[PDB]
Design a protein around this ligand. Structure first.
Ligand code: E91
Length: 327
């Protein structure tokens, strides 16, 4: 398998662009930045609102939990390569403490609105607008030869007052190289594409489009997360109960993948459930024929069949968002 778009980006760019292990980190001054308050955390980092004591401006301080040198370099190089792109979080500095050598990444600040309280209040137009803004970030990083590999609501920061979106946390991102076999232990469970769940390792940018489709399904159907598996096997079962097993079998045969017998047993046999079966009183104002058409073109087993980010942006679902921007 190979990407249908942007496959040669790292083939044509200098090795320095993608050879992140060759990066020499130019460490800044830890004392330039002071923690104010903790705002978030995850398995790999803690995030703090901070202050730059020179200009007394706000920043975000991301203090990394212990990680291999190779992985830190990967995140840094990717952030540097993407810096300035649309809706990409901006890395401003990189520092570490003398005694323990714990690294922190310093980012621009933004007034984030918690997705768990925000999403229930989004209107139809808001969903179209924010998904379009997220697509801009994904088409950009894909065009720069990078797969994010951890798209989920927690990694999409929205300042709802300013209608400003940023795609964050590039710690799981990778450079795309045609034919490369990648680790499938990426993404949050609920956002893992079928390729990860069946051990198809030569995946590509299209992984991010499955994750995006899961977020979009969650928004329009008011179900978060949309596919709620308890472990990775159960995750595939949840997907198969919606998309049906006929399509799964076609996909597995095309890519010459055999499921672990155990997983095969758990998946069983299921008919496809039409997207309209998910409509109800709570979500009805968000569920339109354009929304369903768009969704159906993202949530496909076969990664090669999914819309690219650029194609997604031109779908008529977003026509009003494009018209507003084009003026
Ligand atoms: O990993 C990164 O790339 C990264 C980049 C930027 C940020 C910024 N985070 N900001 C805030 C945040 C994060 C998680 C949970 C809540 C909040 C929050 C609330 C108010 C204002 C800012 C933030 C994080 C990681």
């Amino acid at each position: 398998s190979k990407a249908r778009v942007y496959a040669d980006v790292n083939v044509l760019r200098p090795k320095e662009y993608w050879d992140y292990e060759a990066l020499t980190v130019q460490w800044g001054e830890q004392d330039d930045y002071e923690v104010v308050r903790k705002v978030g955390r995850g398995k790999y980092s803690e995030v703090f609102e901070g202050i730059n004591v020179n200009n007394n401006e706000k920043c975000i301080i991301k203090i990394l939990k212990p990680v291999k040198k190779k992985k830190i370099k990967r995140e840094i190089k990717i952030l540097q390569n993407l810096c300035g792109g649309p809706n990409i979080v901006k890395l401003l500095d990189i520092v570490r403490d003398q005694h323990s050598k714990t690294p922190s990444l310093i980012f621009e600040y933004v007034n984030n609105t918690d997705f768990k309280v925000l999403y229930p209040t989004l209107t139809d137009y808001d969903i179209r607008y924010y998904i379009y803004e997220l697509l801009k970030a994904l088409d950009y990083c894909h065009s720069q030869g990078i797969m994010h590999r951890d798209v989920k609501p927690h990694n999409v920061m929205i300042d709802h007052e300013l209608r400003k979106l940023r795609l964050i946390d590039w710690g799981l991102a990778e450079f795309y190289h045609p034919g490369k076999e990648y680790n499938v232990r990426v993404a949050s469970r609920y956002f893992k594409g079928p390729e990860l769940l069946v051990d198809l390792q030569d995946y590509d940018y299209s992984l991010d489009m499955w994750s995006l489709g899961c977020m979009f399904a969650g928004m329009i159907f008011r179900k978060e997360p949309f596919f709620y598996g308890h472990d990775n096997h159960d995750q595939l079962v949840k997907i198969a109960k919606v998309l049906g097993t006929d399509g799964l079998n076609v996909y597995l045969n095309k890519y010459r993948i055999e499921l672990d017998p155990q997983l095969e047993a758990l998946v069983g046999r299921h008919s496809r459930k039409p997207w309209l079966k998910f409509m109800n009183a709570d979500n009805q104002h968000l569920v339109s024929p354009e929304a369903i058409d768009f969704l159906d073109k993202l949530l496909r087993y076969d990664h090669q069949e999914r819309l690219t980010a650029l194609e997604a942006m031109t779908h008529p679902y977003f026509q009003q968002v494009r018209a507003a921007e084009n003026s």
